[PDB]
Amino acid sequence: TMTDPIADMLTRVRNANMVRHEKLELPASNIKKEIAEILKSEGFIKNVEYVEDDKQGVLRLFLKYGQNDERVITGLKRISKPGLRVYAKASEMPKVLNGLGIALVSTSEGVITDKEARKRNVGGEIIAYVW
Amino acid sequence: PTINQLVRKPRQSKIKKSDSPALNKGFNSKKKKFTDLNSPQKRGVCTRVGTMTPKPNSALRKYARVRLSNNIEINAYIPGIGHNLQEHSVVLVRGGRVKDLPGVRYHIVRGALDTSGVDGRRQGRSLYGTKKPK
RNA sequence: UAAGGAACUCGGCAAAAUGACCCCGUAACUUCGGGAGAAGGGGUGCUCUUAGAGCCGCAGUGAAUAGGCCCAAGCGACUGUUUAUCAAAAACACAGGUCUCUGCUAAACCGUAAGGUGAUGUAUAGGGGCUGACGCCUGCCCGGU
RNA sequence: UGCAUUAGCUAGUUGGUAAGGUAACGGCUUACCAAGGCAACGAUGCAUAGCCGACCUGAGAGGGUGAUCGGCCACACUGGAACUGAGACACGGUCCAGACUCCUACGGGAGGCAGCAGUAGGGAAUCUUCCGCAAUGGGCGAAAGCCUGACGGAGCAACGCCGCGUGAGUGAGAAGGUCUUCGGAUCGUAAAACUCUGUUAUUAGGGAAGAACAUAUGUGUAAGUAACUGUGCACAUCUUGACGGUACCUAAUCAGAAAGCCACGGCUAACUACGUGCCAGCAGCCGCGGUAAUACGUAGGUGGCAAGCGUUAUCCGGAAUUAUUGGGCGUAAAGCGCGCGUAGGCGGUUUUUUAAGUCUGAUGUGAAAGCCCACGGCUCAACCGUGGAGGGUCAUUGGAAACUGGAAAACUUGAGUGCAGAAGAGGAAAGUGGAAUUCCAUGUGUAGCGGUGAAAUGCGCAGAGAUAUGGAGGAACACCAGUGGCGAAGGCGACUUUCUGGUCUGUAACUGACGCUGAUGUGCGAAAGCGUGGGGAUCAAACAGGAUUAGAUACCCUGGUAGUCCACGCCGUAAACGAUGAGUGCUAAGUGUUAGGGGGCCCCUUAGUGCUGCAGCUAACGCAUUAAGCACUCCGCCUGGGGAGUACGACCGCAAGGUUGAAACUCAAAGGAAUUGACGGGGACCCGCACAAGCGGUGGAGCAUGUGGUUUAAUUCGAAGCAACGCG
RNA sequence: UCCCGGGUCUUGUACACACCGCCCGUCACACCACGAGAGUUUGUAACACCCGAAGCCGGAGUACCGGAGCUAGCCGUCGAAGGUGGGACAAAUGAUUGGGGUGAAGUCGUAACAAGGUAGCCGUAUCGGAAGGUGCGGCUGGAUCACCUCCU
RNA sequence: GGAGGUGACACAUGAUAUA
RNA sequence: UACAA
Ligand SMILES: [K+]
Ligand SMILES: [K+]
Numbered sequence A: 001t002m003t004d005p006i007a008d009m010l011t012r013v014r015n016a017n018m019v020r021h022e023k024l025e026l027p028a029s030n031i032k033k034e035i036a037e038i039l040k041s042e043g044f045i046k047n048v049e050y051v052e053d054d055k056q057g058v059l060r061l062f063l064k065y066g067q068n069d070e071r072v073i074t075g076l077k078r079i080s081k082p083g084l085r086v087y088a089k090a091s092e093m094p095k096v097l098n099g100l101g102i103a104l105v106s107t108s109e110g111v112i113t114d115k116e117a118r119k120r121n122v123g124g125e126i127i128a129y130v131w
Numbered sequence B: 001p002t003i004n005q006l007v008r009k010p011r012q013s014k015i016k017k018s019d020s021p022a023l024n025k026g027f028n029s030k031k032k033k034f035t036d037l038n039s040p041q042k043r044g045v046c047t048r049v050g051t052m053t054p055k056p057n058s059a060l061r062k063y064a065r066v067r068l069s070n071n072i073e074i075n076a077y078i079p080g081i082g083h084n085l086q087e088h089s090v091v092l093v094r095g096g097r098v099k100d101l102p103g104v105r106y107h108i109v110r111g112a113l114d115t116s117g118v119d120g121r122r123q124g125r126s127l128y129g130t131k132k133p134k
Numbered sequence C: 001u002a003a004g005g006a007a008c009u010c011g012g013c014a015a016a017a018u019g020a021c022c023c024c025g026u027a028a029c030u031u032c033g034g035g036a037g038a039a040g041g042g043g044u045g046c047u048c049u050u051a052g053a054g055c056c057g058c059a060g061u062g063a064a065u066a067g068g069c070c071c072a073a074g075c076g077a078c079u080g081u082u083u084a085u086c087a088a089a090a091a092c093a094c095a096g097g098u099c100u101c102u103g104c105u106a107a108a109c110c111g112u113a114a115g116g117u118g119a120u121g122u123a124u125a126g127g128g129g130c131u132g133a134c135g136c137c138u139g140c141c142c143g144g145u
Numbered sequence D: 001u002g003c004a005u006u007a008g009c010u011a012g013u014u015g016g017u018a019a020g021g022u023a024a025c026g027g028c029u030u031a032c033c034a035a036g037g038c039a040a041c042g043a044u045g046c047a048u049a050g051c052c053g054a055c056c057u058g059a060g061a062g063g064g065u066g067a068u069c070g071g072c073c074a075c076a077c078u079g080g081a082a083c084u085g086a087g088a089c090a091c092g093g094u095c096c097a098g099a100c101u102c103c104u105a106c107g108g109g110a111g112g113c114a115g116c117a118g119u120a121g122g123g124a125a126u127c128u129u130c131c132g133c134a135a136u137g138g139g140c141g142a143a144a145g146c147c148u149g150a151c152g153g154a155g156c157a158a159c160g161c162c163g164c165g166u167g168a169g170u171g172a173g174a175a176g177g178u179c180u181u182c183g184g185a186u187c188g189u190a191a192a193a194c195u196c197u198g199u200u201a202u203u204a205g206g207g208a209a210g211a212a213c214a215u216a217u218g219u220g221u222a223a224g225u226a227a228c229u230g231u232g233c234a235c236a237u238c239u240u241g242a243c244g245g246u247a248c249c250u251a252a253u254c255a256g257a258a259a260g261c262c263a264c265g266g267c268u269a270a271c272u273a274c275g276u277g278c279c280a281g282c283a284g285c286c287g288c289g290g291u292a293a294u295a296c297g298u299a300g301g302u303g304g305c306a307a308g309c310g311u312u313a314u315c316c317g318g319a320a321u322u323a324u325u326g327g328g329c330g331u332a333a334a335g336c337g338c339g340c341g342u343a344g345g346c347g348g349u350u351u352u353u354u355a356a357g358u359c360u361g362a363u364g365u366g367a368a369a370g371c372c373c374a375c376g377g378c379u380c381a382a383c384c385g386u387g388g389a390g391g392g393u394c395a396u397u398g399g400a401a402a403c404u405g406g407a408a409a410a411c412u413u414g415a416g417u418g419c420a421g422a423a424g425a426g427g428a429a430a431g432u433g434g435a436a437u438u439c440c441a442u443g444u445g446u447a448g449c450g451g452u453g454a455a456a457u458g459c460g461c462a463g464a465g466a467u468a469u470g471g472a473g474g475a476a477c478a479c480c481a482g483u484g485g486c487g488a489a490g491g492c493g494a495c496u497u498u499c500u501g502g503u504c505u506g507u508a509a510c511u512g513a514c515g516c517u518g519a520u521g522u523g524c525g526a527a528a529g530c531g532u533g534g535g536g537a538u539c540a541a542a543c544a545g546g547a548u549u550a551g552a553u554a555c556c557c558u559g560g561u562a563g564u565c566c567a568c569g570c571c572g573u574a575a576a577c578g579a580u581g582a583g584u585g586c587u588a589a590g591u592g593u594u595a596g597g598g599g600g601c602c603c604c605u606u607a608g609u610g611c612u613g614c615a616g617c618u619a620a621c622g623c624a625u626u627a628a629g630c631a632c633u634c635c636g637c638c639u640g641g642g643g644a645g646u647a648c649g650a651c652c653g654c655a656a657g658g659u660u661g662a663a664a665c666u667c668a669a670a671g672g673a674a675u676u677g678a679c680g681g682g683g684a685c686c687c688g689c690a691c692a693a694g695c696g697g698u699g700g701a702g703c704a705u706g707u708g709g710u711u712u713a714a715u716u717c718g719a720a721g722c723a724a725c726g727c728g
Numbered sequence E: 001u002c003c004c005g006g007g008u009c010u011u012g013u014a015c016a017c018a019c020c021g022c023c024c025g026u027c028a029c030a031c032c033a034c035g036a037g038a039g040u041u042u043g044u045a046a047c048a049c050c051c052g053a054a055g056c057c058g059g060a061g062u063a064c065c066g067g068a069g070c071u072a073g074c075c076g077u078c079g080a081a082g083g084u085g086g087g088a089c090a091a092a093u094g095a096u097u098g099g100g101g102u103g104a105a106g107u108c109g110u111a112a113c114a115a116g117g118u119a120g121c122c123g124u125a126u127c128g129g130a131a132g133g134u135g136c137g138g139c140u141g142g143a144u145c146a147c148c149u150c151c152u
Numbered sequence F: 001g002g003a004g005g006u007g008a009c010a011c012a013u014g015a016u017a018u019a
Numbered sequence G: 001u002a003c004a005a
């Protein structure tokens, strides 16, 4: 059955991005909402809408493509996994693509990026790399 | 495999094997047991000198049968043109198999113990136990 | 019965040795039952206290009675039977196997017959031949009889 | 640290009470009571091993090692004890037992280098039976001092590291060597010649530091004293060096004493000649050598290093070749034949809470030496010293609360239930039926039937085969029938009844994460096979005969037993295959088909089952919403070929065998996909005196001629299937 | 149609020194390692029993006040070594024996690779000098030619 | 046109490297 | 070609 809803979200984005879809819908959760907003804030996706329903909510994402239909998102990668959880300290926060990408980190001050985690001197669970 | 499978059954590297097994064993006479020591050479006595034919190649390759100091029997190649060896000769044996000769995995050291140096050698003498002329 | 201990002898024949009870402990092989009492070892008297403390002898199941054991091979599976009176066995029997005869007034057997056995049974039964537990198996020849 | 091809271990054992015992707690010991304790998170047993700081390697993650220096432990010929003592169950103590060695005058006595040297032995291999207590440290002493194989030094060894030499400047193509396309080229500014230097070397002259002291002798001061002596502290005087006349410095003389080792086909820097002729030899790999060898041996030249240079052995790297970082499993090695299911691993949404994981500070600790950075002393450098940094999965303590975990409470999407429909060779049992095969009987009826490439064996005139009717019996179910259906897989196909499993569609009553996977385990599992008992038509291992063939233990023919069938047990294997593990989600289309549903034959929609085809993936072939795409979870499996799914052990089995499963040794490949050819007793088309249709010859005779073989003094040499032989 | 040879296209191939190709197994030869094997030898460790040292525990002689104390000795429990016994395990070797690897192609055939001349392979059974044959089930990882479903 | 299902006499041998 | 027979 479903074991990693976050990796399912990152893969839904990867598959939709591969075929250059305009948008995609997925069932919602709090961390998936916060992951999506960071992608919006960092400029990887266009917009996030939340659609309420009886079951668990729906997240609508809008993908971004530049001139000549070049993909803004190049890749997504799940780092921490149910089979093997990955944690890091602020002093060992990984840089993604030499700083040209981002790492999503779940810290005790919420879900933030790696550049901000070093700024706040907090570590936590490395959710995913986006570049 | 999965991480859980690796935790249950970790990786195992292949065990390396030695090309000169007769050199890496000693013998304690008092306890009549075999040791493991990694010697670079071993003394031995020639049981039967002679010749053997190669496996495309064709020649009469000189060799000796040697009982090493650890009571192991080996076939050792005699390099160089002419040798002074016969039965009951005391020889020093080093590693290095000779291709085209099946069952010969060792070399006799020229110029050590009873083996003489190659006569008339002038190039690469230290490989054939020959003193510097003149 | 000194010392020896199978040197005796066709052959340890005969004799010696073992031997009871109680407690430890027990191999190959096996048809899983066995082998097994395998083997090999410990304890036994008497008095006193309530398992200990003592006492005596060379010796305590102090007499008599009471398995010797082990390793390996042939034959026969086994218990049983036999030459009364020189042979007890590897011979006979055996459970098991197979072949064959027999439809019942059966076949087979006794008897001249009547009458009987088979059987007050009926083919999962009865008679005869060969083989002989069990395991794996049982090849070729139908020319002759 | 290995090994599960080691699964059971323990009976003072585990706990209790009491006593004893110890520096001390305690089954530490004993007595009595109870039956506990350990183990798949690997007990126990076997094997191996002193452990760490460190060291080697590596980008790192890791892998490998424990010599030297430091910490800890253990041991002192082997085993058992105790004594003295603060401390030992004591290396150079005792007692006892044992092995061994030595003295004896046979009663008796003696000894323990794993201290430093040294000897013998073993070994490929590892040093002097040296000097001194001057320094540092230790024991004893009031001290002087004594003792100290600790230690400080010297000796031997290129064993390693670092440093410096073996000359420097000028010098146009000498001789000699080697090669030569005999012009020359090269060794080569190299040599000689001219000058210059003395690191080193030899001879001589000087000559440190390392030494601090202690004692003693004076003064001063502090405490104390009634006071002194003494004691503590301070200053001043005194003696002391194994190394050693060493380091170092100064002067003189001389290029004179001081270069070797490996390599030169490619990897890989550097080529020629001669000798050799698959020999001799070389070789890490590819491989080299069989008469023109840059690969063998030598020579000249060159390259790489240099007081070293090569070889061997061993470890890490290259090796992503055990892949956490960082690999795989359709066809290359690799998905268990398939279910059910235990432990374990993993697990949907939200709120509150917690604080084990996670994060973030504080404190302590992670010795010294080492590594790395900085600085200082050694003429430099090695090396030495000093100051930092680093290294923990460490502990204790204060905070944070997103994620994982724990608690509580909600939720309905996952998963189940209910209700309403539908399809099905799903399974088990018992019945009914039609065709055909074989056999049997009867009637007609006569000469073959049968079989093959051709035959023969075989059956038949005693009436076959054919034909018609009837009977017996076993086995199997035409048509329907379809990349159709059902089942986990194996599998399931006439019809009827009975018993029974699962799936699909719709609905949204209900429960409220109840899920996924699944080691061990437990079951099912084609065919053959095995046991017991039945049955026996057809077919048919074995077998027989007949053919074919050089042979034919085959293929073909005529028969034919087990078996094929049933029941009940066993066996547990198949190319048990989609050669593709299960679960979940996401990612163009087109078009068939099976079972449904909704709406207006078509459109939409579920769940199966096929074909084609994007993106993506792939070594390619190909896969492609039924993935071999993109992801997460769990399981199984792989790590070159052979040996070998073998051996040994173990478990299972009546047996056949099955499951688990090595190594020695050997090779440099084995292998996958695709490509160009060739070939096929593959296919299609086509052609040639190729066959067919014809005519005339050769092979037989004599002779001519060429050849072979024999001869010979010579019978010259060349040509050898077509394509040598009236050929040059 | 057939014998020899050649051309085009296609198909299979384990061939490329290209079918005068490749290649399998028995038997014979030489070396090597390994298993089995009537047996023989050695080592470890436990167990049980017997004996049992020094030591542990218990039970005549010589500062205090003839006595106390003490020592010597004697007895039993525990005690290393040793001996006895039967097993477990491990290493060595053993007439003979089995299969394997390598070397060389000696011998017999020709099993596989082409439809390899009977398509091959898997399991199983059985037979045979050998490769192998045959039966039953399975697979396509089978060539050539048919009749149908599908796709283009 | 390309796939998937379905069905359909005899002929022995040729050493090693180097190619 | 060098071999093998
Ligand atoms: K009978
Ligand atoms: K007869």
Ligand SMILES: [K+]
Binding pocket: D133
């Ligand atoms: K001293």
Ligand SMILES: [K+]
Binding pocket: none
């Ligand atoms: K062709």
Ligand SMILES: [Mg+2]
Binding pocket: C001
């Ligand atoms: Mg007597």
Ligand SMILES: [Mg+2]
Binding pocket: none
């Ligand atoms: Mg007597």
Ligand SMILES: [Mg+2]
Binding pocket: C005
């Ligand atoms: Mg006697």
Ligand SMILES: [Mg+2]
Binding pocket: none
């Ligand atoms: Mg006698």
Ligand SMILES: [Mg+2]
Binding pocket: none
């Ligand atoms: Mg006699």
Ligand SMILES: [Mg+2]
Binding pocket: none
């Ligand atoms: Mg008698």
Ligand SMILES: [Mg+2]
Binding pocket: C020, C061, C066
């Ligand atoms: Mg008695």
Ligand SMILES: [Mg+2]
Binding pocket: C076
């Ligand atoms: Mg009898």
Ligand SMILES: [Mg+2]
Binding pocket: none
């Ligand atoms: Mg009897």
Ligand SMILES: [Mg+2]
Binding pocket: C083
């Ligand atoms: Mg009688």
Ligand SMILES: [Mg+2]
Binding pocket: none
């Ligand atoms: Mg009698």
Ligand SMILES: [Mg+2]
Binding pocket: none
């Ligand atoms: Mg008989």
Ligand SMILES: [Mg+2]
Binding pocket: C142
């Ligand atoms: Mg007859």
Ligand SMILES: [Mg+2]
Binding pocket: none
């Ligand atoms: Mg050790």
